[PDB]
Design a protein around this ligand. Structure first.
Ligand SMILES: CCN(CC)CCNS(=O)(=O)c1ccc(Cl)cc1
Ligand SMILES: CCN(CC)CCNS(=O)(=O)c1ccc(Cl)cc1
Ligand SMILES: *[C@@H]1O[C@H](CO)[C@@H](O)[C@H](O)[C@H]1NC(C)=O
Ligand SMILES: *[C@H]1O[C@H](CO)[C@@H](O)[C@H](O)[C@H]1NC(C)=O
Lengths: 536, 533
């Protein structure tokens, strides 16, 4: 060194790093991208827990994003921004255990609250390097220290032969945990406060945040949590040990690998792409919103099912922010369900609805499916194709996201937690998906991260103000455990969610509005009745 | 000797009585025998036609009420006593009543035939609320009402036997209908225009005449108020009927013939004493002796018959009151009383549901609980109270009615549907009960026209509106005024639009869907759940 920006040279436990000075609309920020936090989980390390990165020599260049974890790439609508924004934007590799840090420039002298993003993508996809997860705006505008990590997905992260030494399960969650431990030890070098760490994530990332809440070894690694449109409880976020074993062994057969030791050793000789090419062939039924390789109830990371853990747990020390978007189900109707497409109005017949219900609730008996159909049908217009399309969307959204979120919010509050809840109702002026899909799963994210502040992105002026409001809620929550700004106590307050009043707020261009009951009637069906009907 | 009050029917001469209605005189012929007294060896047997009589038969007074259980609930309270027998109890009770304008109509007049309700265990055509003088005077109607046997005397059945074949109370009604066909012209009635109307079990009876072929030549249109032949209480299987009669005979100390011969030796009150001890579960809105699916009067279950019937030339008017279930909570559900606001707890609600839906499995009962709970306010006592009432009213009345209306319309019938929403200013029951089962009746019969009863002037106008709908329906099969214009018209109920009207102090308002979501639960889902549980 000698002639470089002195603000971009930082030492961490593993060695020296050189970051990059980035431009945000309001000024510069420091970014340290592609910092290794584990040994590359390759070869004999495939399917194994991550090992901490061994120290390196010299100055590691941390100026670009590292590889994306090897993963299936969505083929729906090539070239279309609505899908492409979620696709990997760096080389796919099994050597992908790297994290990213954004801080103000120059770095703060007083220790700053840290936000850690965990991406979603159904546990089969995602990357910390996507444009929508760009930490520069939260760092510049709110002065946050923002961290995001890559973690293994698909078979590489979640293929499990439970009980085995060579594929114990949940290693993608152990990748996340290792990154949290890296933050505890190192974030002070960047001006971050390791004693104020807030996790946030969306969809499977939210499910992940939920796992860390429920897993004792993660508890010392963060202080507050935000779960956006996802939960550890619910029908897709976990599988039993038996089901994980069945899926792993079928996958092994499909790629020519028919003792766990021998099976796993044969799996390790397979090219990454071979595993990806068969990953979707192991689901027990035709389905949507079901993913082959997800966290497993192993009796270790998860000592019991998340449902059980949230029923009995003491959550007195927990402050949590949770919520959903207006149209959780709509995105998913195109991927499976005859009659749907982003390219037509997707009006469907009653026949397509009945068939869609079997696909959207693949675990349902005939009787359970009838109950669903009966509840969601408009008996004044039982064959109206607009209503049926919207009802199909509501079925998928409620079953997979809204009611699991309502259930989580309810259990946490009853057991000590401080809970704030929201519904996100603003549809981006820039959205490329058709109007009937409303505010789909994932489309609050660009607002939380403050992308509308980028003038080149063509958001309206009101959307910029809106984005700034949300960034304030999120960072207020991270700082204090309360999304409300003191010294603004005239602005409408966001009351905590309680079992008694069930209050949540609407997030849109208008001032906060308080509502009561998170789909209360309908969620009673999914959360109280349906389990009893399935058990008969 | 007023010659307006002297009539010859097939059995002989009758002398009626000139009555006063608020707007002029009416002729009444009360206590006309239509059958041989069903006593002694005729107990439990089909009715036989009345033998002819000599001289002039005195028809100036109401005859005996059919022998029946009398309600003990709130002694001396008008809300209950208005339904109790107002003449002496007797097994000798097969008499009918006729009201006509005075003087006798010069042209043949549409006939309305009233069939009282009372759970098939009680009721009488002599009750004040069934007074036909107002309809006769104001609308010029010829109004007929009959007594029919109730309880064991009307419905005890050993299906297959000769001596207790079942449904004889329905056969009493049918014999009275036959009597109308044969004799009503002598009063100025038109036997080619006969409209049955009835409430609760009376409405269920009307529905059974619709479903029974020999009845179909005896009337032309029907009104069903708050009751239906389909549904959970109005019929029993032959096996359950046989079980109940066999149990009753055991309880009083008694081969079909020998069993029935012994029952016939028992004084009437001994049968009544054990009438309520034969129900299979603790329950409400369930009655021991009701019409039986015999393969005779009823060729199959009402549900099967309304599903497959051809109802092309049928016109029907059907409806419900706003609070069908509220009356019944006092009768079995712990926590309910006319004397306090009956705010109940959640546990009382869960227990209430097992009583109100006695055939429900644990899982079915939980479905009901979870459907009717307001999950925004799950423990709120006033909601739980109102939910309890809705459960009982929807299960026993509202949803069976929606089902019947839908089936009849889909299979060719002309159907008109209503919800009756006006609470009488004079109502003696507490406010929380709203507009209870049975409280549209006094309005249809025109009681507010009686100044000594202190109804408001609005209620008097409302009453006249309803008498018009009912009599227009009787005359034409359509309750709308034939020439008195003005939107809003009352549109036919159809499966597509599902339109019905609200009957209250305001002008007709058209609504769509009779509790559609909730009735889909009762009518489509619950049967599936019960079958597989
Ligand atoms: C996390 C960002 N996502 C939200 C838009 C993009 C798509 N991934 S997903 O997990 O929602 C998903 C969607 C459809 C199917 Cl079929 C499977 C998974
Ligand atoms: C005739 C209209 N009724 C006015 C409500 C009179 C009361 N008898 S009942 O059939 O309604 C009845 C009473 C109690 C129970 Cl439990 C069931 C039915
Ligand atoms: C209403 O009245 C009855 C007794 O008359 C009682 O059982 C019920 O609990 C009362 N409601 C109150 C005061 O809780
Ligand atoms: C919006 O900005 C201009 C139109 O003024 C257009 O050329 C550009 O492509 C748009 N940007 C995006 C990212 O949509």
């Amino acid at each position: 060194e000698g002639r470089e920006d002195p603000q971009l040279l930082v030492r961490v436990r593993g060695g020296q790093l050189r970051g990059i000075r980035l431009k945000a609309p309001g000024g510069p920020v420091s970014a340290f991208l592609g910092i290794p936090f584990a040994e590359p989980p390759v070869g004999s390390r495939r399917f194994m827990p991550p090992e901490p990165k061994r120290p390196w020599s010299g100055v590691l260049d941390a100026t670009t994003f590292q590889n994306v974890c090897y993963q299936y790439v969505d083929t729906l609508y090539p070239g279309f921004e609505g899908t492409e924004m979620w696709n990997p934007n760096r080389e796919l590799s099994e050597d992908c255990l790297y994290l990213n840090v954004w801080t103000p420039y120059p770095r703060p002298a007083s220790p700053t609250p840290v936000l850690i993003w965990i991406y979603g993508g159904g546990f089969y996809s995602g990357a910390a390097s996507l444009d929508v997860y760009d930490g520069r705006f939260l760092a510049q505008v709110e002065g946050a220290v923002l961290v995001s990590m890559n973690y293994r997905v698909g078979t590489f992260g979640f293929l499990a032969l439970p009980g085995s030494r060579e594929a114990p399960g949940n290693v993608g969650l152990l990748d996340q945990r290792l990154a949290l431990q890296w933050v505890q030890e190192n974030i002070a070098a960047f001006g971050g406060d390791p004693m104020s760490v807030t996790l946030f994530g969306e969809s499977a990332g939210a499910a992940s945040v939920g796992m860390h809440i429920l897993s004792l070894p993660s508890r010392s690694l963060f202080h507050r949590a935000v779960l956006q449109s996802g939960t550890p409880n619910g029908p897709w976020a976990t599988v039993s040990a038996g089901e994980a074993r069945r899926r792993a062994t079928l996958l092994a057969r499909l790629v020519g690998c028919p003792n766990d030791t021998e099976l796993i050793a044969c799996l390790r000789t397979r090219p990454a792409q071979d595993l990806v090419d068969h990953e979707w062939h192991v689901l027990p039924q035709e389905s949507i919103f079901r993913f082959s390789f997800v966290p497993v109830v192993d009796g270790d990371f998860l000592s019991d099912t998340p449902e059980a853990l949230i029923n009995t747990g003491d959550f007195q020390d927990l402050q949590v922010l949770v919520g959903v978007v207006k149209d959780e189900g709509s995105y998913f109707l195109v991927y499976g369900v005859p009659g749907f497409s982003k390219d037509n109005e997707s009006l469907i017949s009653r026949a397509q609805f009945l068939a869609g219900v079997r696909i959207g609730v693949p675990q349902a008996s005939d009787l359970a499916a009838e109950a669903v159909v009966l509840h969601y049908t408009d008996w004044l217009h039982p064959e109206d194709p607009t209503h049926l399309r919207d009802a199909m969307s509501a079925v998928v959204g409620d079953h997979n996201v809204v009611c699991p979120v309502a259930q989580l919010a309810g259990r946490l509050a009853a057991q000590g937690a401080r809970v704030y809840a929201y519904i996100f109702e603003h549809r981006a002026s820039t959205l490329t998906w058709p109007l009937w899909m409303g505010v789909p799963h994932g489309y609050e994210i660009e607002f939380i991260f403050g992308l509308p502040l980028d003038p080149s992105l063509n958001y309206t002026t009101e959307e910029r103000i809106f984005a700034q409001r949300l960034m304030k809620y999120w960072t207020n929550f991270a700082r204090t455990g309360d999304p409300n700004d003191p010294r603004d106590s005239k602005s409408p307050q966001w009351p905590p969610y309680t079992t008694a009043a069930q209050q949540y707020v609407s997030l849109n261009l208008k001032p906060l509005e308080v509502r009561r009951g998170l789909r209360a009637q309908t969620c009673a069906f999914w959360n109280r009745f349906l389990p009893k009907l399935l058990s008969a």
